[PDB]
Amino acid sequence: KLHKEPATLIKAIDGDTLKVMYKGQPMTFRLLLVDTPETKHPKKGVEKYGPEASAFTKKMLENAKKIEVEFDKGQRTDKYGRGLAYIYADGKMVNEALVRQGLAKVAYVYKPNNTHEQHLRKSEAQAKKEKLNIWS
Template identity: 50%
Template sequence: MRKTIHSTTWLIIALFLISACGTVSTTNQQPDSDRNATTTSGTTDKVEVSLIRIVDGDTIKVNYNGQEETVRYLLVDTPETKAPNKCVQPYGKDASKRNEELVTDAEKLELEFDVGGRTDKYGRLLAYVYADGASVQQTLLEEGLARVAYVYPPNTRYLDTFEEAEATAKNDDEAVWQQNGYVTDRGFNGCATSQDTSDTPVDSTSNESTQFANCTELRKTYPDGVPSTHTAYQRKFDRDKDDYACE
C-alpha cells in the first residue's frame, strides 16, 4: 500500500512538472502575427507622400510625415542638369522631364524603403519611388534615361530587376546608350554641346580643364559641386572619394 502511494505521488509530481514546462514554453513563444511583423516590417511596406517639386531626374522633394524631405532614388543615376551657362549632360533634361511627368501625373505617389539605412550622408531619404504603383526607377531605366549605380548593400532589393531593365535599354540603344562611351562606371562622360540635351556628348577629357583654387571658388560657379566627368573636377576636392567634388 505504501509503495502504491509513493508511486502515485511521484507520478503527480512528474505530471505537474511537464505541465509547468509546457506553460512556460507557450508563454515565451512569440505569436505568429508578431513574428511575421518583425520579419517583414519596414521592408516592403509603402508609405504615401505628396510631391513638392522635382529636383532632377533621380531626386524629388516630398512631404513625408509632415516634413519636407529630399528623396534620392535608390540604385539609379541620371545625367546631370545645371542652370543655363553651367554643365548640362546629354539627356539630363530629358530624364528630369520624364521624371516630372511620372510623379506629377500620378494620383498616388509612394516610397518604399529597403532594409539598410534610410538616409544618405546628406540627409536625403533613400527610397524606391512608385507612381500609381509603377516603379519610377524601372521606367527611367527601361527608357534609357538612367543607369544602375550607387549599389550599397543591403539596399539592393530590386538590383536584379533594375539591371535587366538597363540591359534591355542598352541592347535597344535607348537614349543614353546611343553613343559608345557616354555611360561609364563613374557616371556620364561629358556635357552637352548646347542647351539641347539631344546633342552629341562631349568627352570632358578633350576640353581644356577649368581650374579652381579651392571648393569655395568652385562653388561660386558650380554651387552644387561637380561630378568626376566635369572639366572642373579635381581629385583633391573629392575628399570622400565618391567621384563628386565640392558637393
C-alpha cells in the same frame, strides 16, 4: 519585407531627386540604385539626356494620382540628409521606368540597399539591347 508608404509630391528637382512631404515634413529624396545624367551636376552642370531625364521624372510624378515611397532594408538617409527610396507613381516604380527608357544607369550598389538590383539590371539590359537614349 519592404512596404510602400504614401507621400505627397512637393517638387521634382532633377532626374534622380524629388522633394516630397513624408509623414508630415518636406524632405528631399534621392532615387535608390539609379544614376541619371544631371542638369545641376556639381562640377559638370548640364549633361546630355539630363534635361530629358529631368522632364521624364517630373511628368511621371506630377501626373500621378498616388505617389508612394518604399525604403530598402539598410540606411534610409544619405550623408546629405536625402531619403533613399524607391518611388512609385500609380504603382509604377520611377527608378525602373528611368532605367527601362535608357535615361538612367544602374548605380554602384551598397548592400543591404540592393533589394531591387536584379530587377533594375534586367531593365537596363533591355534598354541597352534597344539602344535607347543613353545607349544609342
